[PDB]
Amino acid sequence: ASVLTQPPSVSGAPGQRVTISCTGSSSNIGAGHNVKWYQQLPGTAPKLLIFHNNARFSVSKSGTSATLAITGLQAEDEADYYCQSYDRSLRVFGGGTKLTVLRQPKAAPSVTLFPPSSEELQANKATLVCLISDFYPGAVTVAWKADSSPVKAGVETTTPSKQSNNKYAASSYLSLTPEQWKSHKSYSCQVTHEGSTVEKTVAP
Amino acid sequence: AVQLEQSGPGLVRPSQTLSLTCTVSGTSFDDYYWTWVRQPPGRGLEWIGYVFYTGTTLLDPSLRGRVTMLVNTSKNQFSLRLSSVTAADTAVYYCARNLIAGGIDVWGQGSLVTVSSASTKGPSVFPLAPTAALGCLVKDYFPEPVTVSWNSGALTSGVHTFPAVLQSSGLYSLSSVVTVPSSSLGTQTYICNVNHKPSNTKVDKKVEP
Lengths: 204, 209
What we know:
The complex is a heterodimer.
Chain A: E1 9-12, E2 18-23, E3 36-40, E4 47-48, E5 57-62, E6 65-70, E7 79-87, E8 90-93, E9 97-101, E10 110-114, H1 118-122, E11 126-135, E12 141-146, E13 149-151, E14 155-157, E15 161-162, E16 168-176, H2 178-182, E17 187-193, E18 196-202
Parallel strand pairs in A: 1-9
Antiparallel strand pairs in A: 2-6, 3-4, 3-7, 5-6, 7-8, 7-9, 10-11, 11-16, 12-13, 12-17, 14-16, 15-16, 17-18
Chain B: E1 3-7, E2 11-12, E3 18-25, E4 33-39, E5 46-51, E6 57-59, E7 67-72, E8 77-82, E9 91-98, E10 104-107, E11 111-115, E12 124-128, E13 132-141, E14 147-150, E15 159-161, E16 165-166, E17 172-180, E18 191-196, E19 201-206
Parallel strand pairs in B: 2-11
Antiparallel strand pairs in B: 1-3, 3-8, 4-5, 4-9, 5-6, 7-8, 9-10, 9-11, 12-13, 13-17, 14-18, 15-17, 16-17, 18-19
């Protein structure tokens, strides 16, 4: 919420109706000002929503609060939703509501692992790159093994982030010296998701 | 169509003035409140202000004293100058078209401005040799963002640029990978074009098997 207040999160099942409220005060929504709504999909600019002849999206307003209703909820409606109103000529935004569509199928991750380039080894450095994509829901555990033993040091893993397609992507980088890389028969990137592991291995 | 495009520094030192320009095309300049909105990383949208071509202007009261908006009718441009920035002003800045009555209907792409004492550093680019997946490792740059295209934009099919990781060094790395037919690994060339506008560095790296 910001000067206008919105639930931080709302969820609904496909086909269901969900509602997102936007509460302001006597100075803005309660003052005969219009309420506009924007949809913001991952990594894009907000889009203004248009309610004319819109079959699934509609708005209500009473006093100091307004509401966006979505019927026949679909997975491509997952997005952040912001309401906006006016206090004189000032434009005022709500704080945002993340809409989640429930009951979406589990997707196991695709894992791609790259060895250090020879070029980087000339620089006296070595990065192994484990790329993890298209998984759902968004939590994964990434662990690294040098032959069979666990590697803790030198690991940098991103927090998963949602793609346009509604699945998540993540990356883990392991930094080694060229001698540490040459001294093992294999390195594995081990990715566990919802209890199943996908492992990928590379060798000098 | 109506097209709005931001331009400005990607890195600004604390206490300096952030300056950004938006160039407008495909629309009349005189019937709209030319707007700036920003979105701090992981936070909501925050209106900054608007300017009308006559000079009518209004700004968010919490930024009172730091905002100057400029219009240049001959260029169809308008600018934001935000003085005395602090880390708090790190955000994506959008210029937008406010219909006065009707809402903000056209938004630019946004420009990320990072406010930091750290210096820019352009990336080192390494090839990630191989359908086969091949890619480029764009290592140790600051700040975000970096743009990666393949074959000067000719290859779009099956390109996936991953979110950067912020490493303990304080520098970012990311990887871009493209999935290709195995038949092509000899007959077709794969070049990743990396552009890091904050340090004015462009690198082209051919990836071979």
